[PDB]
Amino acid sequence: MNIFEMLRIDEGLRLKIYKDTEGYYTIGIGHLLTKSPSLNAAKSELDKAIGRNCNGVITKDEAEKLFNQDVDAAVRGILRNAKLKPVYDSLDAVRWCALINMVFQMGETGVAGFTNSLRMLQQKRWDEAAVNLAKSRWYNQTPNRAKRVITTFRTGTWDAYKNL
Ligand SMILES: [Cl-]
Ligand code: NA
């Protein structure tokens, strides 16, 4: 499948503000609004993002617009970041989706911090990287999704997304 299809599986779709799997205010297809524990901070960011007074609720089309922007931002983040780009140069089409997925979920800075796992990926040590990634807080917080993403890195196939 493509990265959009993969992320729509992992993120689902919600039209009202919710808390993501990391505890942060979010909306639509995993659109992070703020890391601040402040609901008002989230609402103000939402209205800014959409361009109107949303009162914490958006439409489907607004959600998909944000989604496209967010996948774009994740791809661009991998390319700009000196710690992520070299990894990308070692990843095939399927494995790149796994990296984009991570950057979409945790952000460019967060993923760039996975120093050892990134090196293993860069060196095409797929099984080693898979074992290492499973030791992370990320895995412990969202094991189902992390397992899928890790299998994608490990195998370079879509096996983990085939029947969900
Ligand atoms: Cl390829
Ligand atoms: Na989500």
Swiss-Prot record:
It catalyses: Hydrolysis of (1->4)-beta-linkages between N-acetylmuramic acid and N-acetyl-D-glucosamine residues in a peptidoglycan and between N-acetyl-D-glucosamine residues in chitodextrins. Changing residue 11 to A/F/H/M/N: Complete loss of enzymatic activity. GO terms for molecular function: lysozyme activity. Optimum pH is 7.3. The keyword Hydrolase applies. GO terms for cellular component: host cell cytoplasm. Changing residue 26 to H: Facilitates transglycosylation more effectively than hydrolysis; covalently bound substrate. It holds the Pfam family Phage_lysozyme. HAMAP family: ENDOLYSIN_T4. Belongs to the glycosyl hydrolase 24 family. This is Endolysin. The gene is E.
